[PDB]
Every structure is written in C-alpha cells, then in structure tokens.
Design an enzyme around this catalytic site. Structure first.
Site, PDB file in Angstrom:
ATOM      1  N   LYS A  34      12.800   0.270   2.814  1.00  0.00           N
ATOM      2  CA  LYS A  34      13.138  -0.056   2.408  1.00  0.00           C
ATOM      3  C   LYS A  34      13.785   1.071   1.004  1.00  0.00           C
ATOM      4  O   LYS A  34      14.555   1.429   1.362  1.00  0.00           O
ATOM      5  CB  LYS A  34      11.736   1.883   2.938  1.00  0.00           C
ATOM      6  CG  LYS A  34      10.710   2.419   2.225  1.00  0.00           C
ATOM      7  CD  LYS A  34      10.443   4.357   2.741  1.00  0.00           C
ATOM      8  CE  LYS A  34       9.409   3.488   2.979  1.00  0.00           C
ATOM      9  NZ  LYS A  34       8.826   5.300   3.288  1.00  0.00           N
ATOM     10  N   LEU A  82       7.389  -4.189  12.784  1.00  0.00           N
ATOM     11  CA  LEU A  82       6.487  -4.418  13.984  1.00  0.00           C
ATOM     12  C   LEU A  82       4.968  -5.852  13.295  1.00  0.00           C
ATOM     13  O   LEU A  82       6.224  -6.754  12.646  1.00  0.00           O
ATOM     14  CB  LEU A  82       5.319  -3.224  14.362  1.00  0.00           C
ATOM     15  CG  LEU A  82       5.906  -2.600  14.971  1.00  0.00           C
ATOM     16  CD1 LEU A  82       6.740  -1.355  13.664  1.00  0.00           C
ATOM     17  CD2 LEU A  82       5.321  -1.855  15.549  1.00  0.00           C
ATOM     18  N   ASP A 125       0.430  11.728   5.240  1.00  0.00           N
ATOM     19  CA  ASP A 125      -0.854  10.816   4.491  1.00  0.00           C
ATOM     20  C   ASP A 125      -1.034  10.237   6.143  1.00  0.00           C
ATOM     21  O   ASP A 125      -1.238   8.512   5.586  1.00  0.00           O
ATOM     22  CB  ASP A 125       0.711  10.257   3.559  1.00  0.00           C
ATOM     23  CG  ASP A 125       0.186   9.185   3.149  1.00  0.00           C
ATOM     24  OD1 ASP A 125      -0.979   9.454   2.622  1.00  0.00           O
ATOM     25  OD2 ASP A 125       0.564   8.109   2.105  1.00  0.00           O
TER      26      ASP A 125
HETATM   27  O1  LIG Z   1       5.521  -0.420   6.500  1.00  0.00           O
HETATM   28  C1  LIG Z   1       6.173   0.893   5.917  1.00  0.00           C
HETATM   29  N1  LIG Z   1       5.000   0.738   5.068  1.00  0.00           N
HETATM   30  C2  LIG Z   1       5.800   2.196   4.915  1.00  0.00           C
HETATM   31  N2  LIG Z   1       5.475   2.860   4.276  1.00  0.00           N
HETATM   32  C3  LIG Z   1       3.668   3.047   3.832  1.00  0.00           C
HETATM   33  C4  LIG Z   1       3.082   0.976   3.408  1.00  0.00           C
HETATM   34  C5  LIG Z   1       3.268  -0.454   4.610  1.00  0.00           C
HETATM   35  C6  LIG Z   1       2.876  -1.469   4.461  1.00  0.00           C
HETATM   36  C7  LIG Z   1       3.667  -1.267   2.573  1.00  0.00           C
HETATM   37  S1  LIG Z   1       3.736   0.052   2.264  1.00  0.00           S
HETATM   38  S2  LIG Z   1       6.923   2.142   5.471  1.00  0.00           S
HETATM   39  C8  LIG Z   1       6.787   1.485   6.258  1.00  0.00           C
HETATM   40  C9  LIG Z   1       8.858   1.223   7.721  1.00  0.00           C
HETATM   41  C10 LIG Z   1       7.563  -0.363   8.548  1.00  0.00           C
HETATM   42  C11 LIG Z   1       8.318  -0.335   8.862  1.00  0.00           C
HETATM   43  C12 LIG Z   1       7.552  -1.944  10.354  1.00  0.00           C
HETATM   44  C13 LIG Z   1       7.053  -2.247   9.763  1.00  0.00           C
HETATM   45  N3  LIG Z   1       6.639  -4.089  10.937  1.00  0.00           N
HETATM   46  C14 LIG Z   1       4.987  -4.511  10.768  1.00  0.00           C
HETATM   47  C15 LIG Z   1       4.925  -4.778   8.924  1.00  0.00           C
HETATM   48  C16 LIG Z   1       4.587  -3.499   8.257  1.00  0.00           C
HETATM   49  C17 LIG Z   1       6.389  -2.722   8.523  1.00  0.00           C
HETATM   50  C18 LIG Z   1       6.878  -0.991   7.888  1.00  0.00           C
END
Ligand SMILES: O=C1N=C(NCc2cccs2)S/C1=C/c1ccc2ncccc2c1
Ligand SMILES: [Mg+2]
Lengths: 295, 257
Positions: A34, A82, A125
């Site tokens: 991020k 993940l 959220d």
């Molecule tokens: O997926 C994450 N999403 C965050 N904020 C909202 C969002 C969802 C999708 C795009 S932005 S922080 C975050 C961290 C994260 C960690 C592991 C993951 N594994 C697979 C897919 C998305 C992932 C996101």
C-alpha cells in the site's frame, strides 16, 4: 528501500493510497504493497492509525502487516498476500456461495471483530471489498484506514464513517455517540449479501439508505428504539413502513440464520448483538471450515 | 457492559509496554525536568488555543517521554520534538486536527515546516509507529463510571489533578497511568464529596487505598503547592466554567489515609 520488491500489478484503491501486488525478489514471498505519496501535510492520520492498530492486532482473521518502509517521498505498507477480496469473489460466483462457507466466513469475521472490539478498535469500514480470503478457507479483516482506538465510554467521533450501503442507522440519524455496534450492523449487511448475492441496502444517498432500511425493518418508533424520534436527523415526516418477516428478507436462511441476522440488524445499538455474544449463536453449531474452491 | 473488562485488562497490559524509562533525564546531557515542565505547560496552552481534547495532550506527553527515553536532544530542539509530538497526537486522536502550518505558527517562527515534518518522521521511526498509548485520561473516564452518583465537579478535578501530573517528571514518571488516575480520582472525590475510592473500583482495578498511597501522597503535595508552581497554564485552564472552576477549590489539608 523497495529494491527487493518487484511490482506485479495494481489491484485497487481503498480508504487511502493504492494497493499493489508485488513479489520479494530474494525470498519469493508474494506481498501486497500500500503506497502513500507524502498532500504535504506529513504522514496522514489514516496511515498513522492503520499502522499502530495493525501492529497491536495479531489474529488469524486480521490481515498481517509485515513491514513499513519509507523512501522519503512515499510510505509503503507491506502486507501478507491472500487470494482476493470478498467482493471479487462474489462477482465471480451463477454458482452461489454454499451455506457452510457463508457460516464459516461469518464465524471468522465475528472472531476478527470481537478481537478488534476487545482491543478498543472500531473498524468503521466493514464491506466485502475490505474482507480478504485465501485458498485454504480463511477470511480476514483488512483496510484499517478508517479505524480508530476508542475509549470507554466513547466520546463523539468522526461522523463521516462507513460506506453508505453498510452504514448503521445511528450514524445516518446523527446520534452524537456511536460505538462497536456499527461494525455489527455492517457484518449483518454482509451476511445477508452473501446469502442473497446482492447488497441488502444499496442506497445512493443518506435518505435513500434510511428509507431502504425502513422498508425492510419497519420505520422505528419509541417502543422499538427508545429515543429515536429525538435524534438530530430523525424527521416526523418519515413514511411509516411496516416491518416484514425475515423469511422474506433472506428466504434461503433457516431459523437460526434469521435469528442471528435480526440480532445483528437490531435498530437499538445497545440491544444489537455483540460479536463476542454472536459466536455462541446456535447458527454456528455445525460450523466447519470448507475451502472456497475459487479462481 | 460489553468489552469494558477486556478493554481495561488490555489497557493495563499496554501501559506497561508504553511506559517511558523512569530515569532518562539523568541520561539527558543538556535537558532537565524544569525544561520538560516548560515544554508540557506550553502544550497545555497549545491545546487551549486550538481547543484540542485532553487525550491529545496526554498522548503527546507520552510520545515525548518515550522519544526522550532513547534520543538525546539539545534544549533548543526540545520544542521541535514537542511540536511534532503534538501534531502526531492530533492526527491520531482529533476529528479535526490543526494543519501543519498552524503548528509552525505557534512555535513563533522558531522552526520551519520542513523541520516539523522531518521531526514527525523521526518520532515515528523512534516510536516504531506505536501511538495508541494508554493515558491517565483513558483510565479516568473508566473510573468515572463508578460514581454514585455522577458528579461533574469530581470529574473535572480528577482531570485537573491528572493533568498536573504531566508537568513534573519527578515524581510522576515512576507511576503508571492507571495508578495516577486512581490517585487523581480518589483525591478529587475526597475534596468534593468527602468520599473515598470505592469498593467497586477495588474490585475492577485491584488497587486499594494502601496501594495508591505512595502516588496519592505525591499528588496531594503537588495539589497543595499548585499555586506556587512555576508552571500555571493548567490552573488557568481549569479556572474556566467549562471545567466548573475546580482549580479554584480549596484542597484538603489531611487525607486521613
Ligand atoms: O486488499 C487490501 N485492500 C485494502 N484496502 C481496500 C482494498 C481492497 C482491494 C483493493 S484496495 S488494504 C489491502 C491489503 C491486502 C493484503 C492482501 C491481499 N491479498 C489479496 C488481494 C488483496 C490484498 C490486499
Ligand atoms: Mg539531565
């Protein structure tokens, strides 16, 4: 520095910053990054809050923060990777998500959530896009950018909170105090969405959101929610909709399913079921851990 | 009531882990207790000017003490550490934190924006981004729930006494927030109503009057000597009707126990 990370692809934005999929060039580990560009107001409160809270919270159902990197024009958060988010998963699923998987996901989310609340954290959220799943059957809370450390008792916090569809009626009606119950309401909406395959209350505005909730749960009065007619954004002109049978709200759900959902979607925050109490609901008696069988 | 016990237990865990080094000022070559007192009193004024929550004030002081516990700072840069600490606390705690430009304004042209921003990053790195610290305030609001019945003068005096303890590293840096809050609450309650630390809180905290005595004795002295203290921004603050003018009240001359 980010010498050792290779950016695979941008996967989206959420709450704040841009999330990427990347790879550690030395260990092979797949990670999520991020990125935050340092509005020159310093490190944003959203980053500050997410980082200290995520570092406090170690739980199998909360996303694991691996590292924090500063390359003095940006700030990177490094998470475990993940498979996909729950919204991705539901858009891909014609097929349906089988009940045992819904039960399992709900069970885990409640565990993740009870952990947050026990550690004085409001997520604020909770929505499918912020819930993450892997191939083995786990689901985790992510994106703590809107979260905060609350006190006991709560004081007045930010009113903006929660994306509209998942926003509790006490926020919509402008109550000066809200607490843990707002995360429960959001999980209720998600529970229903997993079963129905569609959002429960897809409003385009605050009043639209309130009216959609009322047409499902009945317009609230002083008997069902003591105090409600006195709330800042309550209007005596509200149409008076009758409450409907929960067998009609989520038809595929059996007796315990309906009972749990109505306790999660209870108007009065004080009477609304806690995540901790919900773990012992008879809905979960036969709970297992199936695999999603995604791709 | 749900989560109140879990939260209390967890806060009691984290106050130990968020505790600064008790004797760090001795290891500070150029700064003193008095200098820190000047700094904290100034933060009180800043909090007043920008109408910030007391919680933000407490958080900032924790950040300062934890930072100073591992970094040597020259007296001329102490205020930069303070300003950056107040900024981070505001971002953590406040709905509407002041802009960085406002923080540069109340320094009186002492430091630049870039200096404040760089100090923010340094404090973060030194604190390893661990900003969710338990405070005297966080325990106080919990303790207030045990009043029978709620008394607004008692609450303000407790908040006042708890705030006085922020100024003087000797002796309050050796007491945990949960303990200072305990002593502040009993001392407040005794002054206003003539009642003592309640059985229900002995139950909750496991602190008795005997256990609080050492802190309670110190806080009683500070209270009695508060009008002669070199730093005065807290007495002036709690003179206001917002806090029911509790700083104008007469402290007791004896505590019995
Ligand atoms: O997926 C994450 N999403 C965050 N904020 C909202 C969002 C969802 C999708 C795009 S932005 S922080 C975050 C961290 C994260 C960690 C592991 C993951 N594994 C697979 C897919 C998305 C992932 C996101
Ligand atoms: Mg010294």
């Amino acid at each position: 520095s980010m010498e050792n990370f290779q950016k695979v692809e941008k996967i989206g934005e959420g709450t704040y910053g841009v999330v990427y999929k990347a790879r550690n060039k030395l260990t092979g580990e797949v990670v999520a990054l991020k990125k935050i560009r340092l509005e020159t107001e310093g490190v944003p409160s959203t980053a500050i809050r997410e980082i200290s809270l995520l570092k406090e919270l170690n739980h199998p159902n909360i996303v694991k923060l691996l590292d924090v990197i500063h390359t003095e024009n940006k700030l990177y958060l490094v998470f475990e990777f993940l498979s996909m988010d729950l919204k991705d998963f539901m858009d891909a699923s014609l097929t349906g998500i089988p009940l045992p998987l819904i039960k399992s996901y709900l069970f885990q989310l409640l565990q993740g959530l009870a952990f947050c609340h026990s550690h004085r954290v409001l997520h604020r959220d909770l929505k499918p896009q912020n819930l993450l799943i892997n191939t083995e059957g786990a689901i985790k809370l992510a994106d703590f950018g809107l979260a905060r450390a609350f006190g006991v008792p709560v004081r007045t916090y930010t009113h903006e909170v929660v994306t509209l569809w998942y926003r509790a009626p006490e926020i919509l009606l402008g109550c000066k105090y809200y607490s843990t119950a707002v995360d429960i309401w959001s999980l209720g909406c998600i529970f229903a969405e997993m079963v129905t395959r569609r959002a429960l209350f897809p409003g385009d505005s605050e009043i639209d959101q309130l009216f959609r909730i009322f047409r499902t749960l009945g317009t609230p009065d002083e008997v069902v929610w003591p105090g409600v007619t006195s709330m800042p954004d309550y209007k005596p002109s509200f149409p008076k909709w009758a409450r409907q049978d929960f067998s009609k709200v989520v038809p595929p759900l059996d007796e315990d399913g309906r009972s749990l959902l109505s306790q999660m979607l209870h108007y009065d925050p004080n009477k609304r079921i806690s995540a901790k109490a919900a773990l012992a609901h008879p809905f979960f008696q036969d709970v297992t851990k199936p695999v999603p069988h995604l791709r | 009531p749900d989560y109140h016990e879990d939260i209390h237990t967890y806060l009691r865990e984290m106050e130990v882990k968020c505790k600064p080094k008790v004797g760090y000022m001795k290891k500070q070559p150029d700064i003193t207790n008095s200098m820190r007192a000047i700094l904290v009193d100034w933060l009180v004024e800043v909090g007043e000017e920008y109408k910030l929550q007391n919680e933000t004030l407490h958080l900032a002081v924790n950040y300062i003490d934890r930072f100073l516990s591992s970094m040597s700072v020259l007296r001329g840069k102490l205020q930069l550490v303070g300003t950056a600490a107040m900024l981070l606390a505001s971002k953590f705690e406040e709905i509407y934190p002041p802009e960085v430009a406002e923080f540069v304004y109340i320094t009186d042209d002492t430091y630049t924006k870039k200096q404040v921003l760089r100090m923010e990053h340094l404090v973060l790195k030194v604190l390893t981004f661990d900003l969710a610290a338990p405070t005297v305030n966080q325990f106080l609001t919990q303790y207030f729930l045990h009043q029978q019945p709620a008394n607004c003068k008692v609450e303000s005096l407790a908040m006042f006494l708890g705030e006085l303890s922020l100024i003087d590293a000797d002796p309050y840096l050796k007491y945990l927030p949960s303990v200072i809050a305990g002593a502040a609450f009993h001392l407040a309650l005794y002054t206003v109503t003539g009642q003592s630390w309640p059985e229900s809180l002995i139950r909750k905290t496991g602190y008795t009057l005997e256990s609080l005595k050492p802190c309670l004795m110190d806080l009683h002295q500070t209270y009695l000597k508060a009008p002669q203290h070199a730093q005065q921004s807290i007495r002036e603050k709690y003179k206001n009707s917002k806090y029911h003018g509790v700083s104008l009240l007469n402290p007791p001359e004896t505590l019995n126990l």
